[model samples]
Target chain A: GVLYVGSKTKEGVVQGVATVAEKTKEQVTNVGGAVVTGVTAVAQKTVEGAGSIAAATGFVKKDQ
Target chain B: GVLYVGSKTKEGVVQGVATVAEKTKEQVTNVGGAVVTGVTAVAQKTVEGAGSIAAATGFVKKDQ
Candidate 1:
């Protein structure tokens, strides 16, 4: 899509954006964190499945 | 594209992602700030143009 933001021979645009990101760092993380968290859960579930394969396989061994 | 991160019936997946976002906040903001800064400059330039319109009109007046 298209993002709307502009400038005029302006390095200040660069400065301004950096300021926003810096200021918004906490919230951005909060939101992105949710995404990462969601994926993290998915990752674990995938690994668990792999473990199941090992357990199911006699050659893998089990029981501590 | 798919993102890879996981868990164990894991709420940790959520936690982990959150942690990443939190941890990465600095960098994320750093980069995102650039975007905001870019836009900010553009915003100012746009305003300047508007001001210019007023200046040209003479009705707005300038020199304080």
Candidate 2:
């Protein structure tokens, strides 16, 4: 799972929230500081604030 | 959201801040520098310090 903050305030507040960049495959990749499963990886556009935040997380579980 | 935090102390200062581990299905699969669910995670962990003071986050969000 890929994450991105499209827009943010001067105080750094995320305006547009989304989980845009997604993985095409669900291969168990060692994501730092978090975990994930059952998600496709789609690497296309450069993820905004890429390394600035968790690069492979932020999924709203469907069964919550 | 696994917020696992252990007891902390300077030399011996156990005020017992109420912050036990809270984990759930809302996994932060991707984590990096900071920012969580539109929240900035990266903080100096201490402010108003003149010099080196063994510091860490004392989870106390201003109740405003």
Candidate 3:
């Protein structure tokens, strides 16, 4: 009886842990997507800034 | 004839936009992978801290 009780308790603990890890993984993935989006905005600005700077230098024609 | 010509011009602009965005997206994704790796390292440290604290308090056996 005690053995069965302990086994059940251990099973519950294991399942709880697995669920927590799964949820944490999902949250991490979602946060990762948001991070990528934010980074993309910054990268877009970087690209635009590079073009603007190049035009300012007169090395490249603004229209060209 | 004018409508078809304008449509081709607009299509080229749209394609250029897509190409730039795709390259930027790739770079952002690479950086995001680095950020996630950093976060995972920190999380591991947090888990280790809890384990060490429990051991220090004698709540759980260090080996167990």
Candidate 4:
């Protein structure tokens, strides 16, 4: 049980994890999906659940 | 599951991660906090749950 985390900014967000499985370099390119880039900060709280609530209005449906 | 997420971009608008998370990161940098460099999409549905919500935010106050 260990996690191989890799935090850039070298903040050591993912050092030697001891609970989850280790992560390979491939995860970033293959699975992490698309990254938005330009993370100016790493705070801990914000407008939580805003995306879904905001996006709900813009959701497009086929049934009219 | 392993999720070592990272990516670079010259584009605007986020491609991954929740808005709350992104904003949280942005806020941290404003408070002299370090950045995570890219948008980290958790892949989890937005507005899924208030508890599932997690990111570096501004409310977190501690040296840990």
DockQ of 1: 0.03
Proportion of true contacts reproduced by candidate 3: 0.01
Q: In terms of docking quality, how is candidate 4 classified?
A: incorrect
Off by over 4 Å in 3: A1-6, A10-64, B1-25, B29-34, B37-64
Per-residue C-alpha lDDT of model 2 across residues A1-64, encoded as one tens digit per residue = 4222343212211223223333333333334332333222222122233213222343222222
lDDT of 1 by residue, A11-57 (tens): 11222112212233434332211111111011111122222321010
For model 1, what is the error of residue A33's alpha carbon versus the real structure, in angstroms, after optimal superposition? Answer: 14
Model 1, C-alpha of A50: deviation from truth (Å): 20
Q: Rank the candidates by TM-score, best first.
A: 2, 4, 3, 1
TM-score (chain B) for candidate 3 is 0.10
Ranking of all predicted structures according to DockQ, beginning with the best and ending with the worst: 4, 2, 1, 3
Tens digit of per-residue lDDT, candidate 3, span A1-64? 1222212111101111111111122222322122212111000111122212210110211132
Taking the tens digit of each residue's C-alpha lDDT, what string does model 4 give over A2-63?
24445433221222212222222322221212222332322222235432222211122222
TM-score of 2: 0.19
Please state how well chain A of candidate 2 matches the true chain A, as a TM-score: 0.20
Better of 2 and 4 by DockQ: 4
- Chain A vs. true chain A, TM-score per model, equals 0.12, 0.20, 0.11, 0.14
Report per-candidate DockQ.
Answer: 0.03, 0.04, 0.02, 0.05
Total clashing pairs in model 4: 11
1 or 2, which is superior by DockQ?
A: 2
Q: For residues B1-64, write the lDDT of model 1, one tens digit per residue.
A: 4232332121211121112222334332322111121111111111222222210110111234
Stretches > 4 Å off in candidate 2: A1-64, B1-12, B18-23, B34-53, B57-64
Interface RMSD of each: 28.3, 21.0, 29.8, 19.7
In DockQ, how does model 2 score against the reference complex? 0.04
Better of 2 and 4 by lDDT: 4
